[PDB]
Symmetry: D2
Subunit: 212 residues, 4 copies
């Protein structure tokens, strides 16, 4: 009824009802998240779901290609809020196979504004150029890129003042490079989990585990 | 097994299996989203879910308090990508009752870095000061604030070059101010849906609909 | 000689020589700046000069229309660096009559990207709409706008965590709203100099001093 | 007289008078800048001066360490404004020997917020790690760093959509990596002047010209 998004308000009452086991109360009561999930705006599947947890149990940021810019106060804000105030136990940068962002980059594809944003990802391409070479294919490189991208981003988090300060001040925290396949639902561990400024080794290891 | 996040990889195989109706294929095949959802990092409930749609059918950005800064290339990027390249039909700023961001603001609460980010929301508080007055309570103001916040943010989207250009170039697009209760799952329409630079009227109307 | 910018390297040796009173040594020795100048990229006249001081005696940021965004880590960075580490005594937002930025705004003029940035200034226009009304002219409004713009920006600085923390921690600091005419070289005091969170009064006063 | 900055208003009338050759009129009449100068907030000496030109003849941005972030709408704004609307002929990233920013970086020195901003410069350190090695000294590395930093930043400008589009659309434009000594006033050419997407060669050359 000119509702514009009527369909959506219907699919909504539709949803609201299906949850008879009365508990939006459970949700509204949910307590502190213990995780920050930084992921891609290709919200192919939601975080809590993927990882099988109640919603809101995971604190979420999403930008195109799950990029952490040193100077992005959008994300930094999220992080300082998750760490300093929610005392989340774990931050994890989760990339996703077949990401439209990492694609558009890779194949120097003009998009307009966001080209600027994807430069960040082109940088990872540049950074790991030779490595990405010895995978002379397509999907390999791509896979390997969305992987590398997630590791670097993690380096970014770990270099933040927010995080370094938390470690400085004793607060337990660990930061994970992580990827998931939208194809197979499964979630891959890159062995990228820093906990104290031992990044130099933890990452070198993790990046070794490409070596074509 | 020192997995650090073993629990999470388990709850994962747990999830992966439960989806016997073999279709991660369906997902991987999912086509263009027709919606951009900008919401709060208090990811109390996921967008597609709330609104009853397959995941990835909705394109998502999340920052603390679903703020659209004129000059935030984090979000602007998402938007230029959603509009210009995904030709999404609808953008909608969705706030959420009992948002931790809108709270921390409201009650001038020091948090650290993100205080800077929440200033944006304090601004809406300032902007609609007298209005928010004639609700001399607490939860009212709060409710009314998370509402107003979502409208203003929409004004922000609608003022973007990205959007104005899309309209300029004929491309059909509509932008909605929207809120949902985590208490009752239900989703409220603020009557804030701009489609062509007719904001001045569409919003004045929408903001009228507080008038204590 | 294909130098591309030969002219500039010449006008340079030209400059280098004219400074016989050997003292680039004096400069290289110059000590801490005691001022942060935030001004417009319309660098109509340099700060130190205007204000008659040795160069480098003033620490400088320049963006289009001397805008301080709550979440601009470009400027915030400059400020945290000037205050926390250079212990500058004074920060001052200095606008400038006939500013091309404040103009382009004012007369809703499409420019492209920076339209987004100028929205910040349109906001001040919005914020002080009625005030700016009772100046039914052109240049008045403009004058009055570049003025108001500089005050608001100051409110922005004063609201920063950086500044609030400095005051919190006792460190003496004062923040000034200031304008200069490129026409007459002279520099106007807006009576906008906050020193401790007494903004609410100091600014109300300062903004009164328009009252058409 | 409690003026707070009386000294400054005096040194001002002092300046205003000394310019008897009546011409603030000349200035106010000055026409379009044909240059964008991006430099460091260590405003050791002003651009026009250094380069011997009337003020305002050069359009100026200043951030800590003259960093161009892919996603910094503060600077990008300046650039889109300088290029698209002022049709400046030349953009030039000008670093400066003994820069406090490049220093603080280099010697992983905690400063607070701006540490985040300087990460950008640490990145150049990382990027050119081995190169910077074969200069086993201090001031060498430093010199060589403030140099490299200015080249990379230029790569950043040249990768911008703004610039690429200008070239796309025929508009003549050239981008220069440039450094100046505050010690000796002199300005060094790094042979870094791109004019059309021929960066890959122009820069490789320019970076060769370190080779310890
Ligand atoms: Zn993606
Ligand atoms: Zn929220
Ligand atoms: Zn200006
Ligand atoms: Zn410097």
């Amino acid at each position: 009824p000119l509702s514009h998004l009527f369909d959506n308000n219907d699919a909504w009452v539709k949803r609201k009802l299906a949850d008879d086991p009365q508990y939006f109360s459970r949700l509204a009561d949910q307590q502190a998240p213990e995780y920050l999930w930084i992921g891609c705006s290709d919200s192919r599947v939601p975080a809590n779901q993927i990882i099988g947890l109640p919603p809101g149990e995971v604190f979420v940021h999403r930008n195109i290609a799950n990029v952490v810019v040193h100077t992005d106060l959008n994300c930094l804000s999220v992080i300082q809020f998750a760490v300093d105030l929610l005392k989340v136990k774990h931050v994890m940068v989760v990339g996703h196979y077949g990401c439209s962002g990492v694609n558009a980059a890779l194949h120097n594809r003009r998009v307009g504004l966001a080209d600027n944003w994807l430069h960040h990802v082109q940088d990872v391409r540049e950074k790991h150029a030779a490595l990405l070479e010895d995978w002379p294919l397509g999907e390999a490189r791509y896979r390997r890129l969305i992987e590398l991208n997630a590791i670097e981003q993690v380096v970014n988090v770990c270099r933040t003042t927010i995080v370094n300060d938390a470690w400085a001040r004793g607060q337990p925290l660990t930061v994970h490079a992580l990827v998931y396949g939208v194809h197979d639902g499964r979630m891959r561990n890159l062995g990228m989990a820093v906990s104290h400024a031992e990044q130099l080794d933890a990452t070198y290891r993790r990046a070794v585990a490409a070596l074509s």
